[PDB]
Amino acid sequence: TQQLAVGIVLPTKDEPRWIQDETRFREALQQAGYQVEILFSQGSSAKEKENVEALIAKGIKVLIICPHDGTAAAAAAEAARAAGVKVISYDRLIRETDAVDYYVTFDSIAVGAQQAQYLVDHASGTGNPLYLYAGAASDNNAFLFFEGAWKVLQPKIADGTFVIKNSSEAVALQNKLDLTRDEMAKIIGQVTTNWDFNTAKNLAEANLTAATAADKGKVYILAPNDGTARAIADAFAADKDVTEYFVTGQDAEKASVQYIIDGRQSMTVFKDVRTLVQDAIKAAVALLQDQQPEARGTYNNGKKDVPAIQSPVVTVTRDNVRAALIDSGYYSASDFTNLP
Numbered sequence: 001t002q003q004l005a006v007g008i009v010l011p012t013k014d015e016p017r018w019i020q021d022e023t024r025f026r027e028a029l030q031q032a033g034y035q036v037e038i039l040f041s042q043g044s045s046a047k048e049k050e051n052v053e054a055l056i057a058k059g060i061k062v063l064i065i066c067p068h069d070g071t072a073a074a075a076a077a078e079a080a081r082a083a084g085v086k087v088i089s090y091d092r093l094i095r096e097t098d099a100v101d102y103y104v105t106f107d108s109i110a111v112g113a114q115q116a117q118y119l120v121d122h123a124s125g126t127g128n129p130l131y132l133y134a135g136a137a138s139d140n141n142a143f144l145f146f147e148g149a150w151k152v153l154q155p156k157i158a159d160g161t162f163v164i165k166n167s168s169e170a171v172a173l174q175n176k177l178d179l180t181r182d183e184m185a186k187i188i189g190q191v192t193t194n195w196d197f198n199t200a201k202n203l204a205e206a207n208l209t210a211a212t213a214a215d216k217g218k219v220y221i222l223a224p225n226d227g228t229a230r231a232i233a234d235a236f237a238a239d240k241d242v243t244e245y246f247v248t249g250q251d252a253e254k255a256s257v258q259y260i261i262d263g264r265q266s267m268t269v270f271k272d273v274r275t276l277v278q279d280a281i282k283a284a285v286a287l288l289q290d291q292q293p294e295a296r297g298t299y300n301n302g303k304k305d306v307p308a309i310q311s312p313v314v315t316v317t318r319d320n321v322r323a324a325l326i327d328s329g330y331y332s333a334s335d336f337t338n339l340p
């Protein structure tokens with residue numbers, strides 16, 4: 001194999017998502033005969049910065065980095081740039097610095113839009129209960145997923161289709177389509193899962209305890225990713241006054257694919273991590289060759305419109321789980337029971 005002057009930093013092993021990227025990186029690197037070190041940050045911006053400093057000292061020329069905390073990662077990105085290291089922000093955006101060269105990402109606005117659109121497409125009449133949930137505020141993607149969803153849900157709240165049951169801040173904002181970041185942050189504060197299973201389950205339980213029978217029945221749940229969706233679904237499934245629920249997700253985690261098969265989760269947004277990984281490797285290799293990656297479009301990070309290498313996202317339900325996840329080669333059918 002060849003050692004590449006590239007280092008990969010991922011935020012934590014305690015969010016299942018990053019295990020997918022770890023796996024997919026290792027597979028892609030093995031295929032190409034490349035050796036590249038992967039370090040995890042253990043959900044610590046200080047450790048993340050250390051990781052970057054260690055990689056700089058090992059002589060990396062390109063850093064692929066998914067920040068734990070996007071704004072906090074600014075000094076790490078700046079340290080890399082200061083040592084002549086190119087900075088590819090990966091999946092999540094490093095904020096509040098111009099020390100980001102590229103951003104390899106899925107279309108996160110479209111993830112939230114697709115989540116919300118699924119809920120809308122399955123609701124009729126008026127006064128349908130709507131329960132909102134969000135990611136960690138330290139993740140810029142949590143704001144993007146929420147925005148994408150809000151821009152679909154808000155008109156359907158304003159027109160009486162949905163009634164928000166778990167966020168007074170969202171209710172006070174429900175006739176405003178274009179929320180500021182500070183406004184979104186107030187909603188997210190009330191409905192945050194912190195990308196954590198127990199936190200999500202407990203919040204759903206608290207919400208259900210506060211809610212009355214009139215707020216239940218057939219309900220609509222904006223869950224921001226797969227693990228939090230299962231936690232929330234588990235709470236809602238247990239409430240006898242919830243006669244039916246529709247719940248969203250993303251990442252196509254295996255356990256959620258099984259919930260979808262089994263009728264316990266309604267959908268997931270599939271984000272093909274194989275593409276994200278290859279996009280990052282390709283950009284790194286181009287930079288190592290003193291060439292520019294192929295970026296189209298930008299994401300603003302508070303200081304800079306960062307050139308984007310963006311990949312699409314796809315809604316997966318029972319109707320297309322086989323086409324989207326199995327026929328695509330993402331997963332073996334043998335991973336699941338009773339795949340339609």
Ligand SMILES: OC[C@H]1O[C@@H](O)[C@H](O)[C@@H](O)[C@@H]1O
Binds near residue numbers: 091092195225
């Ligand atoms: O790990 C929590 C979440 O972090 C987000 O920034 C990633 O884009 C999601 O795929 C993941 O579910």
